[PDB]
Assembly symmetry: C2
Homo-oligomer: 134 residues x 2
Amino acid sequence: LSAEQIAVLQEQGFELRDEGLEFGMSSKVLFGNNLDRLNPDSRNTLTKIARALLAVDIDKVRLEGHTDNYGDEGYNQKLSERRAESVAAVFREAGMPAANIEVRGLGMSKPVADNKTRAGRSENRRVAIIVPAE
Amino acid sequence: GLSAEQIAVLQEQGFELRDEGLEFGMSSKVLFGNNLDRLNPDSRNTLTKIARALLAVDIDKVRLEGHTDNYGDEGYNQKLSERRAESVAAVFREAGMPAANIEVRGLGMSKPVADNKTRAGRSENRRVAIIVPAE
């Protein structure tokens, strides 16, 4: 729960939540037309975030993958896992140990917008980077 | 338009003789593991190393061909195979090869190198081929 860490997190773009601090990127930004391969630029943005967080000795990051509710529920479950794993590999490659990374795929079960509209579904397809408080 | 010094490097990189070119093949199991089109870190490094070796001897053209087995939707499979050959292309672009010198094809299920009757014959069919043509 340290204090100086927040200044980096916020400067990294994290926002405040109950569990801790969270930063989100849409799957459109992260992967474009790919399945779970990150596009080079997003990988670089992520690498920079991973290194800023390591630098202030963050204890844990949790990566949570999400989809909208369009398509097979099981495939969407697995796709959200693989996409959160792609973000997690960026953290490992930047030097964070596996033991300090948790990965979850949520599928369609934790939406942040209305799946009625094409834009709401694009919002719901995302990976969240969470720094828990405890 | 191909040289002996180019051959020496292709061989030690693991390329083999084929019609009108040289080819290096890896299974989707080794390149991607459990992933969709993201390469495992160790296979990405292996591919980077090959790409550097071919750029060093100024390889003018590379073609990348993605294949699947026959299980599941033929449409998804062709998309999958295209996306997985594109994953290999991006390694070659990052290592310095121009986009113009790279040709990416997903052949889906259409060109199998094993039977597909067996789980092992299917895994073999899941693959990407790195083709250095002669002309």
